[PDB]
């Protein structure tokens, strides 16, 4: 830039009372100064001290979602649930259905320099959670042809940031797809925003860096638009979406049961759950709240409210739908996304932020659309945790969400898969890794029957 452009971008930053982001200047390289000139050029100031004002300066009544709008794998009729997962196989095999992932976390618990989807947990086969994820993909596409007779097409948006985006492009292209078509697979970015200080002011990561991060989850709406995910999703029929974040090492991806559950339902947005099982868990919860579908923090949850029991159920809790940020969305939903995408509101997270907790992240949560949405187009389907739910959320040495709590999920699970198929699994001292290129959910290992299998072990194509 010149001396007069660099001036202007000045003037307009410090009218806006951000004019501190160019305090260093003149410690600057020539080519460091282009770098921030460019970063800044790419923020409105004005739209980013409206943001933080709105967010800075912005008892409930809560009953379980209408029983018509619940079902459950442990307690729904077995013939519902076959029906569910055939319908939503037609679906898939109508190229109907597409899986937006949420990979555009910074991961700052689990603190590796990889994305999070580049993690190998351990397993024998050392598959990433990616792999692991392209090949439930491809198991389902395949299973799906069975009934078309014709390739099956389920496109994976992979949602990054800013921090994540090339690595994640260099990652695929290493390991060819997965044997995914490339054109099968979109890496796109969701918005970002400077972080900034308690009084609003933009954060500096270096004297030519400003700080910035993902603009939350809730990002993915806006970022659908902008990036041509959603024109791209009309031009290919797509009717159903999926959506989970990268971190599920057991996410059954594309779910045929959740689609078709959903889709039987013709709500605009579904979600996932869990079972939560005593009444002092520490869990978010999918409920209604002020008679609108919500998601409500436990701290919001009081001893009264989590201790009471479902009186059509008594051995189980009144409130017990545990989200898992798994979420299904029809193509109709997201062609609304302009009329209410701005009032999204963006949340304060309070963060250690280093730079030249002391600053704020502002944050767009996925599911601040759900008090938005009509009763009766919003569904929830409570699913096995032990199947379908473990989270790689902290480092090896924590006991909770980590790599060794993922890898003994998957390997009990695999484990459990074969010995119901006839498999005789002897262990000395623990599980299987079933590559999901055998089976995508238990399916499949017939061939197995009679054999003695020693664990660990890993059964791939």
Known sequence: PSAEEFQQLRKKYTDAGQGHVFAFVDELQTGERSQLFHQLSSFDPVRINELADKALNPPASLEPLPDIATASILDSDPKDLEQWYEEGLKLVAGNKVAVVLMAGGQGTRLGSSAPKGCFDIGLPSHKSLFQIQAERIAKLQLLAQRISGKEAVIPWYVMTSGPTRKPTEEFFEQHKYFGLNKSDVIIFEQGVLPCISNEGKILMESKFKVAVAPDGNGGIYQALLTSGVREDMRKRGIEHIHTYCVDNCLVKVADPVFIGFAASKQVDIATKVVRKRNATESVGLILQKNGKPDVVEYSEIDKETAEAKDPKQPDVLKFRAANIVNHYYSFKFFESIELWAHKLPHH?????????????????????????????????????????????????????????????DIMSQGQRWIEKAGGIVITEGVGVEVSPLISYGGEGLEFLKGREIKAPAFIEK
């Open 348 to 408: 304060v997270a309070r963060k250690k932020i280093p730079c030249i907790p002391n600053g704020i992240k502002l944050e767009q949560f996925v599911f601040d659309v759900f008090p938005m949405t009509p009763l009766e187009k919003f569904a929830c389907i409570e699913v096995r945790r032990e199947d379908e739910f473990s989270p790689l959320k902290n480092a090896r040495g924590t006991g909770e969400d980590d790599p060794d709590t993922s890898k003994r």
